[PDB]
Write a protein that binds this ligand. Structure first.
Ligand SMILES: [Zn+2]
Ligand SMILES: [Zn+2]
Ligand SMILES: [Zn+2]
Ligand SMILES: [Zn+2]
Ligand SMILES: [Zn+2]
Ligand SMILES: [Zn+2]
Ligand SMILES: [Zn+2]
Ligand SMILES: [Zn+2]
Ligand SMILES: [Zn+2]
Ligand SMILES: [Zn+2]
Ligand SMILES: [Zn+2]
Ligand SMILES: [Zn+2]
Lengths: 140, 140
């Protein structure tokens, strides 16, 4: 309940315009993808979520492993994020997390399961998005 | 439950390393901020979430207004995202959304309330993160 870091960003043109952090470390153009009738020459909120979750979940694995005294060199995570209508006048995201750890399958599953309890992105979406988690190419 | 757009991104070094989308529209370096013992010269998952939510929530406002036949020129949203320990061995995000609409306060509140039901980012986190929403400088 203490806060170790916080940041702000501002957008005023939704999905078709600029967005930036207050400190300007991230300054981006956004556009609709071709799939949504746009040019596809700029990024979008689904890509931002995919990048953030891939990094944050990879980090969760690294964190849980370090605390368990398990030495990892890398923890590749591919996050796949989709958007579609929810049938209630809005939209919902779908998320798949494909995690990879250079350990035996069960040990890898145990680490990923704990990472999925620790990670703030997983905590944020639990119960709303049914995140589909894979470990080393198999289902969690 | 149909999907209109999906995308993937991959990270293998957590919060201290590169992350990219499959199509390379977003390719980023990440580092811990100074607040977390890092250089502060690269971005992070909290900033990615703040940028994504600011844009997606601004877009929700624009979408709900268009559907209500309310003409808006812009819809500034500042998303403030924090991270801290959750006391259960992991971390949680805090989110504040400061929305702005050039309409009377109550009309603006009504539009924002509906946007907060429609937006896929709001749908993703509802019940887990108590998003603190403001409209035109006042509480929602
Ligand atoms: Zn595309
Ligand atoms: Zn994480
Ligand atoms: Zn850590
Ligand atoms: Zn490897
Ligand atoms: Zn894989
Ligand atoms: Zn399992
Ligand atoms: Zn800082
Ligand atoms: Zn949205
Ligand atoms: Zn729309
Ligand atoms: Zn204005
Ligand atoms: Zn304000
Ligand atoms: Zn109110």
């Amino acid at each position: 309940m203490s806060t170790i870091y916080q940041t702000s960003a501002t957008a005023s043109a939704g999905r078709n315009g600029v967005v930036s952090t207050e400190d300007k470390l991230l300054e981006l153009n956004l556009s609709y993808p071709k799939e949504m009738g746009g040019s596809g020459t700029a990024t979008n909120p689904e890509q931002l979520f995919a990048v953030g979750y891939a990094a944050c979940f990879s980090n969760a694995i690294l964190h849980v492993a370090r605390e368990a005294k398990v030495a990892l060199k890398e923890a590749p995570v591919t996050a796949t994020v989709g958007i579609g209508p929810n049938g209630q006048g809005g939209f919902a995201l779908s998320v798949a997390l494909a995690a990879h750890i250079a350990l035996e399958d069960e040990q890898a599953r145990q680490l990923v399961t704990v990472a999925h309890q620790v990670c703030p992105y997983s905590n944020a979406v639990r119960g709303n998005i049914d995140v589909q988690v894979s470990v080393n190419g198999l289902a969690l």
